[PDB]
Design a protein around this ligand. Structure first.
Ligand SMILES: [Mg+2]
Ligand SMILES: [Mg+2]
Ligand SMILES: [Mg+2]
Ligand SMILES: [Mg+2]
Ligand SMILES: [Mg+2]
Ligand SMILES: [Mg+2]
Ligand SMILES: [Mg+2]
Ligand SMILES: [Mg+2]
Ligand SMILES: [Mg+2]
Ligand SMILES: [Mg+2]
Ligand SMILES: [Mg+2]
Ligand SMILES: [Mg+2]
Ligand SMILES: [Mg+2]
Ligand SMILES: [Mg+2]
Ligand SMILES: [Mg+2]
Ligand SMILES: [Mg+2]
Ligand SMILES: [Mg+2]
Ligand SMILES: [Mg+2]
Lengths: 142, 103, 48, 109, 54, 117
RNA sequence: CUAAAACUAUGUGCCGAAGCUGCGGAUGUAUACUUUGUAUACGUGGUAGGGGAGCGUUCUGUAAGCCGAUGAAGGUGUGUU
RNA sequence: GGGGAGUGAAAUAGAUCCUGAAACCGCAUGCAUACAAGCAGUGGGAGCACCUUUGUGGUGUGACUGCGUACCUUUUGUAUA
């Protein structure tokens, strides 16, 4: 008897929709990352993506605690000599909540081809409606 | 119908007709050996988990024969210190064939 | 038992001469028992 | 059945002849002869010599019609170099290689 | 002024990946059946139904 | 007795270069580079014989954790309960069972649950 | 990361090394004991360096032998110990 | 310069001529490779191709993934820039 790897051809991805209204950002992102990586399945394999699709709706209603809405800084560098840019959590969540969720979740994922493939399965929407009704997602209440 | 058995400091999930390599045994190439310390026997809605051993379960195998695994090269080298050491290795195994699982 | 094929020296009579600088495995390799970087490690290195 | 012609010892480096050899690999011999006729490359002359030699070999020694022959294989290998001296400034000297090449052409039905 | 490492054969070929030649534009002339370079006179001196050096 | 070291040296270099088949560039063609590549492959394989056991145990533990969380447990409490229930199945077999037979793994989780109570 | 993913105190589990244990194999020293083979025990990271045991290469004898055109040496693959 | 024909036991023994290694340079086939960061391997591992077989087989390749800063010398100490 030897230990078997999940074959990529028999991996069954499932669709889920989670509502982010009034949830702690990091404490929701850990569960999202666990679902995207496939860590909740017994066929789990570190070199295979066996995770699920996760739809995040009402992404702009996600919450941070303490004074982080004003104190949490998001940085960028344009790679130009003085081009370090900075924004707020509350400015960026009223402008690009999808970038907030992507930054939170991408840092909790592996960094490489498999990690990019895993991040492709998180679909983030600021409103209450998503366009994936053809995929029939189930309500994952975290 | 599978059973968990112990052989050579290792546990194996076996089914009937399975041919598996375990650590070297003393039994000769026609002997039939018996495992009476079966740990679990599953038959389908009939699951007997021994704590630690299933009471009367027995698994009979046939010694197909002994061999060695393919050659492993062991290389040791300490850089800048003038030390190098090479060794070969082939591990002995016994190849068994599972004949019967009682449970 | 008396042939030029079947004559042997006594056990312990012959030893192999030691050969320096013939690799790591021999144990007398790179410097051949001389150590590193002194007067005694040079050619004709003994003091009187 | 392939018919071969070998132009051994052509006075040109293989790197330059290979550019012409790549142009006609896997083509009809009529198309290849057209391509070689209207090229301004020095290698085109030598490759045309070798290719028309292979076509003549196929017709005479093997009795194959030319209308369906094809450049089924061609490659350029290096040959024996000539070594020469080139004086340089300040008494320095450099070594010049005069590179040759062998062209192999195989035509097939 | 000069390389610090010898370039591998693979990078050398990747540089030469742009070195291929192109064929020319050839047309079959109808007044002679000949093949010539397009918009060029033939080697017999013909071009578009006109003759040089009769 | 002049000894020409041509056949033996060639044989040794050919052995080292045969152990280098598949390596990139000089590492499979040039003896000086191939020899270092081969010695390093050996050191790596020695170290990875040890690392493989850690890697496979961590895989089994992740799979058991997934199976135990599908049954209202966690790896910690399930292993503790199976050790309190005198069950001595090791992690490789437990992970194989979790991956291939969910009913038997639910039965094992029931043993562990009843022992934890 | 904020009734923490911090800190203090306490507890129950678990993970975690080439450590320990299990299984298989080799080897050094010593002791028994056949009288040189097995047990038993303790050991087996190493530079300088010391000690012990071997492989292979050319040449001389063994050899006016033995193998070789039904194919030597050499070269290039494969399988195997 | 070559292809035949012929000679020869042999002509990839054809005069740059016994054997004809490596570096190095072609062509052909199989597989991989144009969203992805580093001593180029190693452990695992899907898929494909070809052999064979009713293999828990072999041969080539290697998506993805954990770990991983050449060798020598000299040094207290070197991935050392
Ligand atoms: Mg020493
Ligand atoms: Mg020195
Ligand atoms: Mg000193
Ligand atoms: Mg000294
Ligand atoms: Mg190439
Ligand atoms: Mg361990
Ligand atoms: Mg130990
Ligand atoms: Mg032992
Ligand atoms: Mg030790
Ligand atoms: Mg030692
Ligand atoms: Mg020959
Ligand atoms: Mg020759
Ligand atoms: Mg791609
Ligand atoms: Mg210094
Ligand atoms: Mg210094
Ligand atoms: Mg260091
Ligand atoms: Mg350096
Ligand atoms: Mg550098």
């Amino acid at each position: 008897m030897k230990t078997l790897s999940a074959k990529p051809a028999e991996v069954q991805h499932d669709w889920f929709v989670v509502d982010a209204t009034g949830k702690t950002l990091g404490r929701l992102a850990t569960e999202i990352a666990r679902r995207l990586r496939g860590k909740h399945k017994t066929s789990y394999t570190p070199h295979v993506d066996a995770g699920d699709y996760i739809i995040v709706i009402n992404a702009e209603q996600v919450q941070v605690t303490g004074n982080k809405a004003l104190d949490k800084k998001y940085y960028r560098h344009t790679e130009f000599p003085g081009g370090l840019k900075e924004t707020n959590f509350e400015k960026l969540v009223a402008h690009k909540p999808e970038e907030i969720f992507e930054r939170a979740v991408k840092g909790m994922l592996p960094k490489g081809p498999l990690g990019y493939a895993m991040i492709k399965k998180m679909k983030v929407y600021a409103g209450s409606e998503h366009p994936h009704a053809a995929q029939q997602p189930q309500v994952l209440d975290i | 119908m599978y059973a968990v058995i112990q052989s050579g400091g290792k546990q194996h999930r076996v089914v009937e007709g399975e041919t598996l390599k375990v650590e070297l045994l003393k039994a000769e190439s026609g002997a039939t050996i018996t495992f009476d310390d079966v740990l679990m026997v599953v038959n389908g809605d009939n699951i007997q988990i021994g704590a630690p051993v299933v009471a009367g379960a027995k698994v009979t195998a046939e010694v197909i024969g002994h061999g060695r695994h393919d050659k492993i090269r062991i290389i040791k080298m300490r850089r800048r210190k003038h030390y190098r050491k090479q060794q070969g290795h082939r591990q002995w195994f016994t190849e068994l064939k599972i004949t019967g699982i009682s449970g | 038992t008396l042939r030029l094929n079947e004559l042997a020296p006594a056990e312990g009579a012959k030893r192999e001469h030691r050969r320096l600088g013939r690799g790591i495995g021999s144990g007398v390799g790179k410097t051949g028992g001389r150590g590193i970087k002194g007067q005694k490690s040079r050619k004709s290195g003994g003091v009187r | 059945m392939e018919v071969t012609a070998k132009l051994r010892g052509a006075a040109i480096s293989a790197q330059k002849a290979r550019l012409v050899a790549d142009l006609i690999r896997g083509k009809s011999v009529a198309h290849a002869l057209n391509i070689l006729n209207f090229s301004n490359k020095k290698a085109a002359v030598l490759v045309k010599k070798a290719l028309e030699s292979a076509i003549a070999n196929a017709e005479h020694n093997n009795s194959l019609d030319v209308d369906d022959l094809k450049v089924s294989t061609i490659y350029v290998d290096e040959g024996m170099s000539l070594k020469r001296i080139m004086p340089r400034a300040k008494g320095r000297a450099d070594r010049i290689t005069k590179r040759t090449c062998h062209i192999t052409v195989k035509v097939g039905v | 002024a000069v390389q610090q490492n010898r370039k591998s054969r693979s990078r050398r070929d990747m540089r030469r990946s742009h070195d291929a030649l192109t064929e020319n534009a050839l047309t079959v002339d109808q007044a002679t059946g000949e093949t010539h370079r397009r918009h060029h006179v033939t080697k017999d001196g013909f071009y578009r139904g006109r003759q040089l050096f009769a | 007795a002049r000894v020409k070291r041509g056949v033996v040296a060639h044989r040794r270099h050919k052995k080292i270069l045969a152990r280098a088949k598949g390596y990139y560039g000089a590492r499979s063609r040039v003896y000086r580079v191939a020899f270092q590549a081969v010695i390093k492959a050996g050191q790596y394989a020695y170290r990875d014989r040890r690392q493989k056991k850690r890697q496979f145990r961590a895989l089994w533990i992740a799979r058991i954790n997934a199976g135990a969380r599908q049954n209202g447990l966690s790896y910690s409490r399930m292993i503790d309960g199976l050790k309190k229930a005198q069950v001595i199945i090791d992690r490789r077999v437990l992970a194989d069972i979790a991956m291939h037979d969910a009913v038997a793994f639910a039965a094992l989780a029931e043993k562990a649950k009843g022992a934890l109570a």
